[PDB]
Design a protein around this nucleic acid. Sequence first.
RNA 1: UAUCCACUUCUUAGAGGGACUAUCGGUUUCAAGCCGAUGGAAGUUUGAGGCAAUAACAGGUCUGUGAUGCCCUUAGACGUUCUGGGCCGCACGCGCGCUACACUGACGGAGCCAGCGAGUCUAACCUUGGCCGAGAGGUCUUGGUAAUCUUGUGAAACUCCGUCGUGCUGGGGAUAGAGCAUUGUAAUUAUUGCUCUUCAACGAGGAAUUCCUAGUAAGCGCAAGUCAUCAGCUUGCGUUG
Lengths: 112, 127, 143, 135, 127, 103, 78, 37
Amino acid sequence: IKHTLDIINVLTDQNPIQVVVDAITNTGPREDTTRVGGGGAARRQAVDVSPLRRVNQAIALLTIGAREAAFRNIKTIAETLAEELINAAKGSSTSYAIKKKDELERVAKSNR
Amino acid sequence: SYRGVDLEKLLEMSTEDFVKLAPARVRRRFARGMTSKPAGFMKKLRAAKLAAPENEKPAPVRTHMRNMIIVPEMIGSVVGIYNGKAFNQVEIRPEMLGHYLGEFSITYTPVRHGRAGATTSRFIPLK
Amino acid sequence: PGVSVRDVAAQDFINAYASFLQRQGKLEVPGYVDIVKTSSGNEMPPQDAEGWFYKRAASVARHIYMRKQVGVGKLNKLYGGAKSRGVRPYKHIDASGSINRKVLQALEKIGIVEISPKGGRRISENGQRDLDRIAAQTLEEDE
Amino acid sequence: SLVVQEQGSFQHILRLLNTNVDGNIKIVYALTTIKGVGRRYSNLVCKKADVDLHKRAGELTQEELERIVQIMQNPTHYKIPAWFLNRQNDITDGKDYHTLANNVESKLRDDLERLKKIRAHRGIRHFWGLRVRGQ
Amino acid sequence: AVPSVQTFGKKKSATAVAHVKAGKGLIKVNGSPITLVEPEILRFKVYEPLLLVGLDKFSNIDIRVRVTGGGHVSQVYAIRQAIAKGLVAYHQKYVDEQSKNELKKAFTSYDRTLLIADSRRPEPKKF
Amino acid sequence: IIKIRITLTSTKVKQLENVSSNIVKNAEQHNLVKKGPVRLPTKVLKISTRKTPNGEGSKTWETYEMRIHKRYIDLEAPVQIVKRITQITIEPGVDVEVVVASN
Amino acid sequence: ALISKKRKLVADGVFYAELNEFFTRELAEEGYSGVEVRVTPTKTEVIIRATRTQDVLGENGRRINELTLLVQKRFKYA
Amino acid sequence: QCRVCSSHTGLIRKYGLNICRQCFREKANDIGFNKFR
RNA sequence: UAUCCACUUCUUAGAGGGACUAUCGGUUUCAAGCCGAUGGAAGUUUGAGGCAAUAACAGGUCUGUGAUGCCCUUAGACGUUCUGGGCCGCACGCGCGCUACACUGACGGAGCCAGCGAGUCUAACCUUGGCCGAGAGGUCUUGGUAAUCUUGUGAAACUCCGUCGUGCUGGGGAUAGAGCAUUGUAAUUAUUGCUCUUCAACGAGGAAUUCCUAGUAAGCGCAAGUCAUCAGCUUGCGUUG
Ligand SMILES: [Zn+2]
């Protein structure tokens, strides 16, 4: 974390903690879907997540995206997570977290 | 050869000089001690050796311990080693030195698995 | 307001006295320094093959200053060799004895360690003077 | 430290003691490619001969290769003692040797046919296993 | 007879005893200073009782810190709890009460655990 | 003039306390120099036992426990006083040991 | 002799338990209530607290010496 | 072996005691081992 | 390990305290109770197991007793010994685990933190310290019959500084050979430890499945039992969390 925050110091960025909280905000799951029974043919129901759980898989999705971007490549966890965290501070769709976020959003829009 | 040493000079020294040319297991086996019955074994071994006809095989000496280190006063002798059930008549050649006697005496017939006809035929009857 | 090794860091002190042993060179170096491994619990030789011996000497002098006296088993658990034992996992394995013996005997032969009356190896007054002196220019390298 | 780069004069694939080595990895781990020589033996062989092992094997000269080759057949004269060698106190001649890449297989075949003509349990077990899982 | 204050500090089976004396103003932990702690990132955790009240209060007091038990991080919590407890005990006994009140409000505004040890003792195995 | 160190071991604390209080109140009442009853930590002896003597169900465990307490009081007394106290103080549950030397 | 301290006390408890069970099973008809033993530096004294004592000491101490030899032979004493 | 019931199985060999466990589980209180916790 | 003095702040043996769901607010015939908040060391019954009375067990033996039913009364070894082999043998299925598939990492140096324990007599346990040996270890002595010595068990994971660059690689360590040591009367079907070499499959695992709500999962070592020698077996302890 301190090497990552040192990288976002030198990512032409003056406010790296603001990059952290804005990527937490921008990777909030706004609409999800659940698994209702429904009698065999289970359809999907539009359901919204609690803010505590929203920051839960916001943090978790950012870390697992940085982990699988940090697996089997030379580039370290700090540099991958800095790229992940600056690509999620603004909506860019080049990051795993934004991609799974609007994937679950279009799943929630397609299941109502 | 044993240590680059010609065999006919190797036939005529004593056991301590074999220990001085031995690996570590043989020296550690010698360093503690034996029981008295291999002295009778080597006595009847050389008694069967001295009654050998010339240019032929000597009398068989039926051996039973499977843990003894080979010491080459029995070069040219032939021994039958107990496996637990039967005997394997093995002659001593001077290239098997530094070895246990029980590795010349197997303990089982091997596990056969490439026989599907005998396996299929012997299943338990279901009637 | 006195200067000692108890105010300096470890790594710069070991580097400094390794450099001073390299520049002075008044020790005993046998012919198997470029042969031996540091422990049975090691697998590769040290990378600084011309200078790991003086690193070991700096280490053992720094541990003899910080306590009353040490023995060879204390140095062997102090190094703490860990074996990848093939399929079998890591354990604690005591280090090589003769490495500790030769760095100690080469260090009484020059006059920093002495044998304590309690059976161990204690720091002498010349060694206290030498380690406090090199601690003084250890402070006088970062002025 | 300092970067030192040379215009050319490095070879990609070399060959020493009738065995191929590659000149981009370090000297020790280019000498792990040959069989019968591992890591630690190659470290000891190279660190006897005052070879800098931080640099790579592409800038090895022929006078280093010849002295490494000269180390290989008789290491006992140059303070490489008995316990580092593969052939130690052999039953044939009683001396010590480090077996080479075309000699490890002759050693293994010699051990197996020696166990055959001894007719030991190890030999008949190994050849029965080879003749059964082979078929 | 130097004015001395002895106060403990405990976390996770590791107790640090802090002897707060009067002197030139000096911090040592087990014969090593506060600028050299064995974890280099928990150095600021040991620095946290210094920064939370003020750097001028330590001009007149020498603090003797000895810790045993535990591991690395538990010893860091033990020595920082011992330092905060000994500082407020010296400012209770010798210095006036309202000064110690300002120290203990400054400590509880950031770290509640600096004055009360951990209530997370290891559980029974539940046989 | 002989110095005698008396060490008392007992698993029960009530009889050990009664023995130690009787020893202290008997030693102080006829003017002998002594130390107090020095209190060693209580040894807890634990052993593990299966909940399943028979092989039915899952494997779960319990623990049997013991408590052993140790005290020792140092005395200075003549020989006859030591002999009469050693004759008097023998009680079940508390073990009394008499040490002559001080090395 | 010279047993380590916890092993000494546990083996002493086994010694109390074995004499307790042996005197429970042996003199069940002579009013057995309990036993206590005293360890002296000279010898070891067994005090039999059985409430029918005239049957415990028979003619010229025969059953007393009998139980004494039962303690002697099994428990390896001089 | 276990000198109570000729038990050749389930021995515990600690402290030179050699009782089987199935005889130790009822004679523990007479020895001194009591269930506390 | 006594130069004296003070103390138990930490360690510990105790006597007591304290908690009784205390107080408040909802809910409830507004009755016993339940839930949320504050204070509290502790406010899910703060957390855990043993103990009864009762009706049911052809369950197991006691080397218990009654001219008790059964078969021979013995050339049967169901009694003794002596050696030698095993129980580990391998197309394989199932299951419990260990190590890995890597660069939050492998290697080399330095920093270095624990606790539950345990330890020898008419024997040889835990072992300090000194010499030799690459090591395994050997050897010469000493301490502890134990909060005293091993031991502050200076444990490992970890922390830093350097090597390695994504390449079945320097990851991995299966297999195998040679030599040297230790225990055992005896080590071959290799007891175990050390040195060199061999560097096999194995690029996060399908159907399905196990365990778990706070010092808890998980990683990590250490101690105790099995012990003559080794653990990948079990129970605990401690570190990080
Ligand atoms: Zn039994």
